[PDB]
Amino acid sequence: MVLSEGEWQLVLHVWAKVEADVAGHGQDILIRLFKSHPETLEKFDRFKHLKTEAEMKASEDLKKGGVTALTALGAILKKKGHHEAELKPLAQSHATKHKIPIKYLEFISEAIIHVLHSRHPGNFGADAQGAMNKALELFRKDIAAKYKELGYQG
């Protein structure tokens, strides 16, 4: 499932807007994830104490975690599919230490799409959302294959 250059440019043009304020986008995305799928919060200990959206917005550690995850994702997207080196350590840490199933990567992909659709209607019309979906599907397919190589069914 190879993206075209035109699809990559749609992905990168909306990501350029995320990069005006990665911290604020990360807060919105993690909060959307945790509200839509509370098991992703309650099962991981780093944030399991956060009870409300107000607590989530006030959490400096949640903000930092969102910046870390979105910056890693941006580096993957900028490789335009040539992301084998970037996926290796990420797959290992997410398949061995604290196991993050593919289902949860699907949930955060939905949260990314939801927040980009809300914040960026000027760069996230239907074609751009389809391109981002393709990019996130490729990411998940390749990390799922690495999970299996590493001994984790995902």
Author numbering: 0 to 153
Authors' own words:
Here, we applied a combination of complementary spectroscopic, crystallographic, and computational tools to investigate and elucidate the mechanism and catalytic steps of a recently reported myoglobin-catalyzed cyclopropanation reaction with diazoketones. An optimal biocatalyst for this reaction was established to be myoglobin (Mb) variant Mb(H64G,V68A), which delivers the (1S,2S) cyclopropanation product 3 with excellent stereoselectivity (>99% de and ee) and up to ~1000 catalytic turnovers (TON).
During the investigation of this reaction, we noted that the protein undergoes a peculiar change in color from the characteristic red color to green (referred to here as ‘Mb-cIII’ species) upon exposure to the BDK reagent in the absence of the styrene substrate. When crystals of Mb(H64G,V68A) are soaked with the BDK reagent, the color turns from red to green over the course of a few minutes to about an hour, depending on the crystal size. After optimization of the soaking and incubation conditions, a structure of the green complex was determined to a resolution of 1.40 Å. To our surprise, structural characterization of Mb-cIII compound revealed that this species corresponds to a protein complex in which the BDK-derived carbene moiety is transferred to a ring nitrogen atom of the porphyrin cofactor. As a result of this modification, the heme cofactor is distorted with the pyrrole ring C lying out of plane at an angle of ~30° compared to the planar heme. One of the heme propionate groups, which is typically located on the distal side of the heme, shows dual occupancies, with an alternate conformation of the propionate group being translocated to the proximal side of the heme. Furthermore, His97 and adjacent residues at the proximal side of the heme also appear disordered due to the translocation of the propionate group. In our structure, the α-carbon insertion adopts a tetrahedral geometry, indicating protonation of the carbon atom following insertion. Based on these results, it can be derived that Mb-cIII is able to regenerate active Mb, and thus re-enter the catalytic cycle, via a reductive pathway that involves the release of 4 as byproduct.
